[PDB]
Amino acid sequence: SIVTELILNADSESRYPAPKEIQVYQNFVKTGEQRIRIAKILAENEQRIVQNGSARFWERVPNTPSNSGNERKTASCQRDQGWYIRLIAYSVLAGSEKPLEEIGTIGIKEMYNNLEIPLRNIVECMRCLKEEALSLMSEEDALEVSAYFDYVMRSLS
Amino acid sequence: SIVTELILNADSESRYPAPKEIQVYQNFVKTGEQRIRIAKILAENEQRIVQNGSARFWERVPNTPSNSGNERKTASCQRDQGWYIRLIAYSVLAGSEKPLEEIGTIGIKEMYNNLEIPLRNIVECMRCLKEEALSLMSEEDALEVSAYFDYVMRSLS
Amino acid sequence: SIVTELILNADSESRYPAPKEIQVYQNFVKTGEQRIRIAKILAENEQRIVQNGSARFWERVPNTPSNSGNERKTASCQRDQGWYIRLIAYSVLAGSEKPLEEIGTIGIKEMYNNLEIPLRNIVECMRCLKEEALSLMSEEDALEVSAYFDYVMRSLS
Amino acid sequence: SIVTELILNADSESRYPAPKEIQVYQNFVKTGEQRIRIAKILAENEQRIVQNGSARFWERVPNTPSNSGNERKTASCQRDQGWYIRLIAYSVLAGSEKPLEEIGTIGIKEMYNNLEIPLRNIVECMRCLKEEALSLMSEEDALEVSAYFDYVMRSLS
Amino acid sequence: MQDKLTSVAKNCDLTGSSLNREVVETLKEFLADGEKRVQVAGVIGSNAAEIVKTAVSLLFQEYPELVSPGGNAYTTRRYNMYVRDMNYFLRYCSYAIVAGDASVLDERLLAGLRDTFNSLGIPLGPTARSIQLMKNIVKEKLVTAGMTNITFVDEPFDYVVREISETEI
Amino acid sequence: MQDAITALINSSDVQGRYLDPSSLDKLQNYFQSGDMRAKTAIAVSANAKNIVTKTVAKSLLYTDITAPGGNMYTCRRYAACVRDLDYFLRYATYAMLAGDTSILDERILNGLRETYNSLGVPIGATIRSVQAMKEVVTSLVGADAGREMGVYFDHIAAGLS
Amino acid sequence: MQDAITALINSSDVQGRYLDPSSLDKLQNYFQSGDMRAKTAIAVSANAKNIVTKTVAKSLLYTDITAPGGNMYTCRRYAACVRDLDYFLRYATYAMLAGDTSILDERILNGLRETYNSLGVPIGATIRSVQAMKEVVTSLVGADAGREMGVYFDHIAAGLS
Amino acid sequence: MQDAITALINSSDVQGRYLDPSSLDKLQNYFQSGDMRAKTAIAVSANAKNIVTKTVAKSLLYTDITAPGGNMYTCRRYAACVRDLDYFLRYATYAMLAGDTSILDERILNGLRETYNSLGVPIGATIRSVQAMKEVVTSLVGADAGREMGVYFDHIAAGLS
Amino acid sequence: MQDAITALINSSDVQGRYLDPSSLDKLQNYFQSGDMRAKTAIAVSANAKNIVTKTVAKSLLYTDITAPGGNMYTCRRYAACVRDLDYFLRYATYAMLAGDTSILDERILNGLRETYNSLGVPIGATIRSVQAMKEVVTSLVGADAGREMGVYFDHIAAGLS
Amino acid sequence: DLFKYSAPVRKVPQFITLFGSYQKPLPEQHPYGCGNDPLEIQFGAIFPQETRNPHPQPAFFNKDTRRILIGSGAGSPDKLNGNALGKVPGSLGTRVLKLEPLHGHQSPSVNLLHHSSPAFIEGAYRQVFGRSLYEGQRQPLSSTESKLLGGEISVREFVRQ
Ligand SMILES: *[C@H](C)[C@H]1/C(=C/c2[nH]c(/C=C3N=C(/C=C4\NC(=O)C(CC)=C4C)C(C)=C\3CCC(=O)O)c(CCC(=O)O)c2C)NC(=O)[C@@H]1C
Ligand SMILES: *[C@H](C)[C@H]1/C(=C/c2[nH]c(/C=C3N=C(/C=C4\NC(=O)C(CC)=C4C)C(C)=C\3CCC(=O)O)c(CCC(=O)O)c2C)NC(=O)[C@@H]1C
Ligand SMILES: *[C@H](C)[C@H]1/C(=C/c2[nH]c(/C=C3N=C(/C=C4\NC(=O)C(CC)=C4C)C(C)=C\3CCC(=O)O)c(CCC(=O)O)c2C)NC(=O)[C@@H]1C
Ligand SMILES: *[C@H](C)[C@H]1/C(=C/c2[nH]c(/C=C3N=C(/C=C4\NC(=O)C(CC)=C4C)C(C)=C\3CCC(=O)O)c(CCC(=O)O)c2C)NC(=O)[C@@H]1C
Ligand SMILES: *[C@H](C)[C@H]1/C(=C/c2[nH]c(/C=C3N=C(/C=C4\NC(=O)C(CC)=C4C)C(C)=C\3CCC(=O)O)c(CCC(=O)O)c2C)NC(=O)[C@@H]1C
Ligand SMILES: *[C@H](C)[C@H]1/C(=C/c2[nH]c(/C=C3N=C(/C=C4\NC(=O)C(CC)=C4C)C(C)=C\3CCC(=O)O)c(CCC(=O)O)c2C)NC(=O)[C@@H]1C
Ligand SMILES: *[C@H](C)[C@H]1/C(=C/c2[nH]c(/C=C3N=C(/C=C4\NC(=O)C(CC)=C4C)C(C)=C\3CCC(=O)O)c(CCC(=O)O)c2C)NC(=O)[C@@H]1C
Ligand SMILES: *[C@H](C)[C@H]1/C(=C/c2[nH]c(/C=C3N=C(/C=C4\NC(=O)C(CC)=C4C)C(C)=C\3CCC(=O)O)c(CCC(=O)O)c2C)NC(=O)[C@@H]1C
Ligand SMILES: *[C@H](C)[C@H]1/C(=C/c2[nH]c(/C=C3N=C(/C=C4\NC(=O)C(CC)=C4C)C(C)=C\3CCC(=O)O)c(CCC(=O)O)c2C)NC(=O)[C@@H]1C
């Protein structure tokens, strides 16, 4: 959350929040309604985003562990897509990428290397999901959604 | 300014400005007209603010170097009041307390202790100047100015 | 005490006391009787020192909390003067400013800023107390007492 | 080189080479005949190894930029294979992986990601090259070669 | 708890020096003053209430704010607690004078005293002052009784103060 | 640490599901209270040293604590008590801004009791000081914001016992 | 560091006077251009890796600089060159957002030529690659934003010269 | 660390009083004994190596401690035991010079038992060695100064037991 | 640093081709000389102290350098010169074992002349000391190994001049 | 504490421990309590939580107590012989990470130090952080690493950053 970031930044200097940080806090809490609306949009459309993104991802990358005939692998890939959509919704709510980075980005390469999932394929799937999500949203609301999808893609690459 | 602050925040992590910094930047540039108007108000009314604040300050703290029969000391105190109003106008224009911090807050205690000027007297004078300045501003235009006056007073105490 | 300083200086180098430390120790042990006499002089003349120093201090610096008509504030200031005379007597006994530094100098600025007592006024009061205490002793007896008073005054600035 | 490693191991302790390091040095210089023979084997059979490994790697991974129909990309890939065989020959001659690590392992992922070449494909090509090179040498003779190929693959992964 | 003889005898086996010359000399020196220790304890026990009353009255003279409203000796409840605790201190100091050893003070007087006083907000400065006042009164009574070499009487009281007082330097 | 938004996010995340309507309502409540929280933080920042001065005058001055032999005797121990009070005030402001007491538990309270016991600091006196600080803040700011800050002051006091 | 607003503020402050109307007009111009500057920063952040790979492909690849004995030979030197180009792009974006080249002169060009001369890095090849990066960015973000970033790319090239 | 003067000053300071005649008499006693204390410090410093040599010879050598499997076996452990005896002698000299045992409480005995039990150092052999060192020092500096140093040697030994 | 093998690898890699038959011949020559190099290193390791003693005795002793006002006056400067000679001998042995002089350039001669000039260390005396050290090593290890070590001693002397 | 309802929740004995420690000198623990002593492991700050399985044993450590520490015996041989008598299991004795400072032509392809640059950087990270960071976590410090590799900053400055 951006509030935690501001408080920790102030605390590292052992000082009360500066007027600029208070302005940042006020501007963030001012826009809470739009963030809640965007998170609700992502939550409602998560399944169709996952379905369409999976269709595009399997059309574009057919040689992937998801569509290797393993039902469990397909289900796990779908669940991972839903989980990353949920984490992006969390980040939209918090006004910062801290939820997404602390739940699904720090150590993502280690986890997926241990799982033996190609990282390029995950990047392609994330791109397809980002396109699907940006389809079902206005551009002004999709700014942070695209930014956080790009954050995931950069963390994987 | 806040632009430099957010650029430095992005640079501290060696990455491009995140959507939080971009939102801060957009909210700052959308208030440029208001900040220019507030700075113009401060510049136009600087003299009357100084005179009224100094009158209230000498009423509240009669025993202070700025009124002891020394014309030069009185002139220097009123010059300091005008200078701090100018620095607060700079801070309003910049969207951050940084200009005031560099020009008249870092080492303010050392400078005024070298001059043998009591710091709590300056705090009272800044309080009177804040009261005078906020009474010629809108209700919403007084938030930033009040924050910067509080910043000066806190740096003094 | 100077003995503790010598022992700690030797311990800093993990060695037995060098001839310089031994010579300092022997000189201090020789002067101990004079130190006891000076401490007795300070103890038996504390009240008149406080009274005369307070009179001179209020004549020189009339704008102090101790001279604001508040009986409690005056009593507290005179108690502080007595306490500092007691600490200087301790330091005379110990041959070093260690008692005065540990009990009444470290954190003196923070304590008196919390109490909102101007530090310049305390410096002036210490100067007056030093002037009144030095008149009660010989020059060689006053040699160390003046140094301890100067130590308090320097710590207050 | 392991001679440099022995010298610097003795240097970190600021001492002349110990008998253990001298024994290692003598054992190493006694294997120069075999190391030069292996390097000659790699130099003579570089082209056939490159061709066979390219054929097997394109059979295993048909969708790669090396055989995407661009002759320049194919030539660059085959040149890279030859270069890595050369680096492995250098490492065999030196007795350690340090030459290979310094020339074609530090920053290999960044270089190939800038070139936009999937790293898994390069791992597969390295595996094919390793299996082609091992077949041209006897056991107890190609242990270091396989180790260096594994080193390249591990750096890529 | 141990007295001087018990501690010395146990240390004789502990240190491996057995009953050497220094131990014999210390034992003889201690036994030389045993009758005086018994006499001092008898004087303390025969005048305990007077000693405690005098010391507490002098304490309230030197700390007049203690008995004022908001003070720690405010009300008869807290006054009685003052008298009770000063009697505790005097009794255990008399014990330590008899035994010639401070282990009784360590085990039954000072163990956990600071924790209790912090829990109850009992000020330690006045406690040390009251102990010193009781010591001075005991010394005066011993001088009146005619005792001459009573340096050891200082040892418990001072020790207790050093154990309860905070570190200033 | 962890604020209100992060607390709700983690409550949803341990179950692996999006924020349920109750959590969304709580988040909206925090978003609406953010303005009051910012104003209170500004007020406390402006008068931090004055707040601590009033706290010390109200709860510690002219007691046996500052008398010779007391724990606030000598200038260094007085300044140390003032430093601890400054820490308490700053972190109460942090917790009020965050809407959560997590930072107080993490940074201030986890080990303070054993530290005070080792140092001999009277815990009852410091609890009374924290309550006096709560009174001073509620007099400076107001009733509603004073109560909001008093929530975290009370959490500090409970963690000190 | 210093940006456009701070530059104007310092220009006024060195004379001890408020911002004159010309400075206010320049400030208004910067405020009006801020939206486009933020849009360019977002685009460059999104396409940073693509910009750097296109720069290398069209400037340094398949020349003597990557052949053995060249300064971009071996993987570590290639990675170092790519990292340097990433630094150039990121700090040019910082300078474009700030509206001033002070960040470039403080974090990039201060001693860069001396360092490159010490290492043997070819200055001409670096300048050519900076020009190629400017062209790539201009292609990506359009004409106006392209030349806005090209101002700072040319500043980098001049600093290297 | 406190010496005799600092201890008396502390006892007077917690009461907020000047030094009473009893503490002044104690201070005069310390000042009178200072010359003997300095002489004893000089004597112990001049013979520190010989004191430790004789202590080891008469308390540790040719026992099972120096035999293989003993705690003074190997050169490192022998040197460490000699170093520890040096520590004890030096800090006993410090305490004798100060006229107070607080230095031993704060720098020698604090955690010494836990450290020795963790390392396997024999506590009883250490106590016997300290007793032997006290006997050697007494034979070297006489009965009176020997007893004065033995006060602090016995403080160390009692702390170890 | 580099040794013979690494130097050949570098020379081959700059031109991007395998070791040509001449480089392989040089590599075989180094491999054959490895045994003599090991024996020489063992001998110099065994007699390093005597080598430096004889070097100082025949090069620097009983001159104006060791007299008051000279650069080898005081024990600290004498020990520093002896330490520098130790460095020269040890790194010459390292270079002889490696077959390359790059260790001397990187670790010894890199800015040594400037350090000596700033400190005031006579360069000519140091060169004479290095030559005397070469003579001593030659007298100790023989003519062939003597000249093998003399190559690196002469490299040090030339890098100093 | 026994009369409170949380008495059956504390498992560590509270009476026998205190009664035993009454007879002993200061414990081997942090002056702020046993809860201020982390586990001495490779990485991770593991502390006793006050409220979970509570077993705090405060002691009255004054401001001048100095802890007794067991030396590990690690360090370079030149920085030894003053505290070489310590020995702790799991100590890499002479394996300290040291980087000599760097002092118009490009470097050779293969230049070998004791540790390669990535190996030294990983060692520095493993010492400062206790363990290797994850993949992307080193991104903010890349420029710093560059300044360490180019000799702009020392290892001390790199550690500070
Ligand atoms: C007199 C020279 C100046 C001054 C004095 C003044 N003092 C107070 C109150 C306090 N003074 C102290 C001082 C000390 N505490 C310590 O531990 C030590 C070290 C030995 C010192 C010197 C303290 C703690 C207080 C607070 C009250 C208390 O004792 O509990 C006041 C304030 C009185 C009030 O209540 O308003 C004043 C005014 N005033 C002057 O004008 C002189 C310059
Ligand atoms: C072949 C196994 C794989 C393949 C490779 C490929 N490489 C390039 C281009 C380049 N390769 C290099 C290689 C190196 N440079 C070094 O310094 C080292 C260390 C010794 C190496 C290995 C370089 C520099 C280039 C760039 C061009 C140049 O040489 O100047 C290409 C073409 C890239 C392009 O877009 O033109 C290709 C295709 N591709 C595969 O699919 C294989 C797995
Ligand atoms: C003031 C309200 C009361 C008081 C306080 C007091 N504190 C100290 C000293 C210390 N207090 C702490 C506590 C903390 N450690 C932490 O990590 C935090 C959270 C950030 C806190 C609050 C510490 C570490 C110290 C340091 C002790 C030292 O000197 O090393 C003192 C001084 C004690 C001393 O013996 O010097 C005091 C007086 N005491 C009162 O009586 C007030 C009621
Ligand atoms: C690429 C366009 C060209 C190139 C680059 C190259 N640079 C280095 C080495 C360094 N580069 C820098 C630059 C910076 N470091 C910083 O932190 C910053 C500011 C954020 C800058 C601008 C530095 C300091 C170095 C030296 C330290 C290091 O190695 O990291 C190399 C490596 C050279 C070598 O011999 O190792 C290279 C190759 N070289 C070209 O040929 C391109 C034209
Ligand atoms: C003989 C070459 C020289 C010499 C020796 C000498 N040693 C002693 C006594 C002891 N020697 C040791 C040695 C060691 N302890 C260890 O742990 C190790 C490493 C494994 C060694 C080498 C010890 C412990 C002693 C003390 C006696 C004991 O047995 O406990 C003596 C006797 C000294 C005395 O009686 O005081 C001697 C003479 N003496 C020479 O002249 C030779 C040069
Ligand atoms: C000799 C009389 C006995 C003996 C001693 C012995 N000690 C050690 C090791 C240590 N001794 C200490 C003690 C201290 N360090 C301090 O700083 C202080 C305060 C000034 C003291 C008292 C410590 C810390 C150690 C640990 C190692 C170190 O030097 O840091 C050893 C070696 C133990 C080991 O093997 O590590 C020995 C043998 N042993 C006997 O048998 C004698 C009776
Ligand atoms: C005499 C007590 C012992 C002794 C001495 C001895 N010394 C030398 C030669 C030299 N002595 C020095 C000494 C110093 N140089 C300094 O800078 C200082 C610090 C002020 C000192 C003490 C030096 C430099 C030399 C070298 C000769 C010169 O002066 O240039 C010798 C002769 C050595 C030789 O091999 O020729 C001797 C014999 N010898 C004993 O037996 C005594 C124990
Ligand atoms: C002896 C042959 C001559 C001599 C030498 C001398 N040198 C110094 C000081 C330094 N010597 C060095 C050299 C090195 N340090 C290293 O780490 C290495 C590589 C392993 C080398 C070659 C350095 C760096 C210094 C300066 C720092 C230091 O003193 O350690 C001195 C001391 C100078 C002074 O006045 O302090 C001396 C005397 N001097 C002669 O006259 C001989 C001819
Ligand atoms: C995996 C098999 C199981 C698992 C592990 C797990 N561990 C952590 C975090 C830590 N692990 C350690 C352990 C060590 N510290 C050391 O010094 C060493 C020796 C080198 C080891 C093995 C530590 C200290 C931590 C703390 C955090 C850190 O990384 O510093 C976690 C993360 C827990 C968290 O809340 O952060 C996990 C998950 N957990 C399982 O469920 C597996 C069965």
Cα torsion at G82, G87, G88, G92 (round to 10°)? 150
DSSP string of F4-33, one letter each residue? HHHHHHHHHHHTTSPPPHHHHHHHHHHHHH
Cβ(C33)–Cβ(H24) below 8 Å? no
Query: How does D108-129 read in b/e, with b if 16+ C-beta sit within 10 Å?
Result: bbbbbbbbebbbbbbbbbbbbb
Residue of C nearest to B113 (CA): C157
Under 8 Å CB-to-CB from H15, ≥6 apart: which residues?
Answer: E125, E128, E129, E132, F68, F69
Cβ(J73)–Cβ(J88) below 8 Å? yes
Cβ(A53)–Cβ(A131) below 8 Å? yes
| Burial grade of J78 (CB within 10 A; 0-12, 13-18, 19 or more) | exposed
| Long-range contacts at J84-90 (CB < 8 A, ≥ 24 apart) | J84/H76, J85/H76, J85/H79, J85/H80, J85/H83, J87/H76
Residue of H nearest to J25 (CA): H110
Closest CA to H89 of H97, H60, J72: H97
Cβ(H55)–Cβ(H29) below 8 Å? no
Instruction: Give the type of residue at B97.
Output: E
Cβ(A2)–Cβ(A96) below 8 Å? yes
Ligand 7 proximity of I53 Cβ (cutoff 6 Å):
no
Cβ(A5)–Cβ(F14) below 8 Å? no
Instruction: Give me B45's structure tokens.
Output: 């009314």
Instruction: Give me H83's structure tokens.
Output: 């170093």
Ligand 1 proximity of C52 Cβ (cutoff 6 Å):
no
Ligand 7 proximity of I87 Cβ (cutoff 6 Å):
no
Between the CA of D90 and the centroid of ligand 4 the distance, in Å, is 26
Cα torsion at D90, D93, D98, D104 (round to 10°)? 10
Which ligand 9 atom lies nearest to the CA of residue J46? 24
Closest CA to H122 of H59, H62, H75: H59
- Count CA atoms closer than 13 A to J3's CA, side-chain side: 0
- Count CA atoms closer than 13 A to H154's CA, side-chain side: 16
- CA B55, CA B48: separation in Å to the nearest integer? 11
Residue of G nearest to A151 (CA): G46
Q: Does F74 touch chain C (CB under 8 A)?
A: yes
The DSSP code for B127 is H
Task: Tell me how many degrees the CA angle A99-A103-A108 measures, rounded to the nearest 5.
Answer: 125
Pocket mutation for ligand 3, best pick of J36, J50, J63 (most atoms within 8 Å of C-beta): J63
- CB atoms near residue J53 (< 10 Å): 11
Q: Return binding residues of H for (2R,3E)-phycocyanobilin.
A: 62, 66, 71, 74, 76-77, 81, 83
Closest CA to J161 of J137, J135, J143: J143
Residue of C nearest to E168 (CA): C103
Which ligand 5 atom lies nearest to the CA of residue H62? 30
User: If you count them, how many residues does chain F have?
Assistant: 161
| Burial grade of G26 (CB within 10 A; 0-12, 13-18, 19 or more) | middle
Closest CA to C99 of C42, C54, C56, C53: C42
Pocket mutation for ligand 1, best pick of C61, C71, C115 (most atoms within 8 Å of C-beta): C115
Closest CA to F96 of F42, F49, F47: F42
The DSSP code for F105 is I
- CA A55, CA A67: separation in Å to the nearest integer? 10
Residue of F nearest to H17 (CA): F68
Under 8 Å CB-to-CB from H75, ≥6 apart: which residues?
Answer: none
Residue ranges of A 77-116 with Cβ closer than 8 A to chain J? 105-107, 109-110
Instruction: Give me J19's structure tokens.
Output: 């009664």
Cα torsion at E38, E39, E44, E45 (round to 10°)? 70
D52 phi and psi angles, rounded to 5 deg: -65, -45
Place of tokens 């980075």: A101
Show residues of chain B in contact with G13, CB under 8 Å: 86, 90, 99, 103
Between the CA of D3 and the centroid of ligand 7 the distance, in Å, is 41
Q: What is chain F's Cα-based Rg?
A: 18
- CA I3, CA H155: separation in Å to the nearest integer? 63
- CA B139, CA C131: separation in Å to the nearest integer? 57
- CA F92, CA J10: separation in Å to the nearest integer? 30
Under 8 Å CB-to-CB from H84, ≥6 apart: which residues?
Answer: H121, H126
C-alpha distances (whole Å) from D87 to each of I16, J103, J119 are: 10, 29, 20
How was this structure determined? It was done by cryo-EM
Cβ(C41)–Cβ(H41) below 8 Å? no
The DSSP code for B14 is T
User: If you count them, how many residues does chain E have?
Assistant: 169
- Inter-chain touch F42–B153, beta carbons under 8 Å: no
Closest CA to F40 of F51, F25, F54, F53: F51
Cβ(G140)–Cβ(G47) below 8 Å? yes
SS3 G81: helix
SS3 J31: coil
- Count CA atoms closer than 13 A to C32's CA, side-chain side: 24
Instruction: Give me B142's structure tokens.
Output: 């007084």
Place of tokens 């933080």: F41
The DSSP bridge partners found for residue B67 are B64
List strand residue ranges (DSSP E) for H12-119, in order. none
- CA F112, CA F129: separation in Å to the nearest integer? 15
B64 phi and psi angles, rounded to 5 deg: -155, 155
F95 phi and psi angles, rounded to 5 deg: -65, -40
Q: Is residue F6 a known part of a binding site?
A: no
Instruction: Pick the ligand that lies closest to the CA of residue F84.
Output: 3
SS3 B70: coil
Closest CA to I37 of I159, I156, I157, I151: I151
B67 phi and psi angles, rounded to 5 deg: -130, 90
Q: How far is C113 from chain B (nearest CA, A)?
A: 9
Instruction: Give me I31's structure tokens.
Output: 């491999």
Instruction: Give me I19's structure tokens.
Output: 């070791």
Resolution for this experimental structure (Å):
2.5
Cβ(E157)–Cβ(E128) below 8 Å? no
- CA A58, CA A51: separation in Å to the nearest integer? 11
C-alpha distances (whole Å) from G159 to each of E65, G52, G100, G112, J144 are: 76, 20, 14, 8, 22
- CB atoms near residue C34 (< 10 Å): 14
Show residues of chain F in contact with J56, CB under 8 Å: 113-114, 117
Task: Tell me how many degrees the CA angle J20-J25-J27 measures, rounded to the nearest 5.
Answer: 80
Instruction: Give me I123's structure tokens.
Output: 């360069």
Q: What is chain A's Cα-based Rg?
A: 17
Instruction: Give the type of residue at E89.
Output: F
- CA B150, CA B155: separation in Å to the nearest integer? 8
Instruction: Give me B16's structure tokens.
Output: 């491009």
Closest CA to I136 of I79, I37, I59, I42: I59
Ligand 2 proximity of G70 Cβ (cutoff 6 Å):
no
Of C40, C83, C93, nearest to H9 by CB-CB distance is C93
- CA B125, CA B60: separation in Å to the nearest integer? 9
Which ligand 6 atom lies nearest to the CA of residue H121? 39
Residues within a 6 A CB radius of ligand 4: G 60, 65, 71-72, 77, 80-81, 84-85, 87, 107-108, 112, 115, 119, 121-122, 125-126, 129; J 106-107, 143, 146-147, 149-150
DSSP string of I88-156, one letter each residue? HHHHHHHHHHHT-SHHIIIIISTTHHHHHHHHT--HHHHHHHHHHHHHHHHHHH-SHHHHHHHHHHHHH
Between the CA of J134 and the centroid of ligand 9 the distance, in Å, is 14
3-state helix, strand, coil in chain H (%, to 5): 75, 0, 25
Cβ(A25)–Cβ(B102) below 8 Å? no
Cβ(A84)–Cβ(A104) below 8 Å? yes
The DSSP bridge partners found for residue B155 are none
- CB atoms near residue D102 (< 10 Å): 26
In chain B, the N- to C-terminal Cα span, in Å, equals: 24
Show residues of chain I in contact with J98, CB under 8 Å: none
Rounded (10°) angle between helices G75-98 and G48-59: 120
Cβ(F18)–Cβ(A89) below 8 Å? yes
Instruction: Give me F129's structure tokens.
Output: 């000081």
DSSP string of D63-88, one letter each residue? SSGGGSS-HHHHHHHHHHHHHHHHHH
Cβ(E71)–Cβ(E14) below 8 Å? no
Which ligand 6 atom lies nearest to the CA of residue H126? 43
Cβ(I149)–Cβ(I40) below 8 Å? yes
Query: How does H54-85 read in b/e, with b if 16+ C-beta sit within 10 Å?
Result: bbbeebbeeeebbeeebbbeeeebbebbbebb
Cα torsion at G54, G55, G61, G67 (round to 10°)? -140
Place of tokens 């033995």: H150
- CA H26, CA H8: separation in Å to the nearest integer? 8
Cβ(E31)–Cβ(E100) below 8 Å? no
| Burial grade of F103 (CB within 10 A; 0-12, 13-18, 19 or more) | buried
DSSP string of D4-71, one letter each residue? HHHHHHHHHTTSPPPHHHHHHHHHHHTTHHHHHHHHHHHHHTHHHHHHHHHHHHHHH--SSGGGSS-H
Rounded (10°) angle between helices F21-46 and B142-156: 50
- CA G95, CA G102: separation in Å to the nearest integer? 7
Instruction: Give the type of residue at D142.
Output: A
Q: Is residue F75 a known part of a binding site?
A: no
- CA J24, CA J104: separation in Å to the nearest integer? 68
- CB atoms near residue A96 (< 10 Å): 25
Closest CA to G27 of J112, B40, J60, A76: B40
- CA E89, CA E134: separation in Å to the nearest integer? 9
- CA J25, CA J65: separation in Å to the nearest integer? 12
Pocket mutation for ligand 6, best pick of J68, J69, J81, J91 (most atoms within 8 Å of C-beta): J68
Which ligand 4 atom lies nearest to the CA of residue J106? 35
Instruction: Pick the ligand that lies closest to the CA of residue H64.
Output: 5
- CA F129, CA C97: separation in Å to the nearest integer? 33
Between the CA of I130 and the centroid of ligand 8 the distance, in Å, is 14
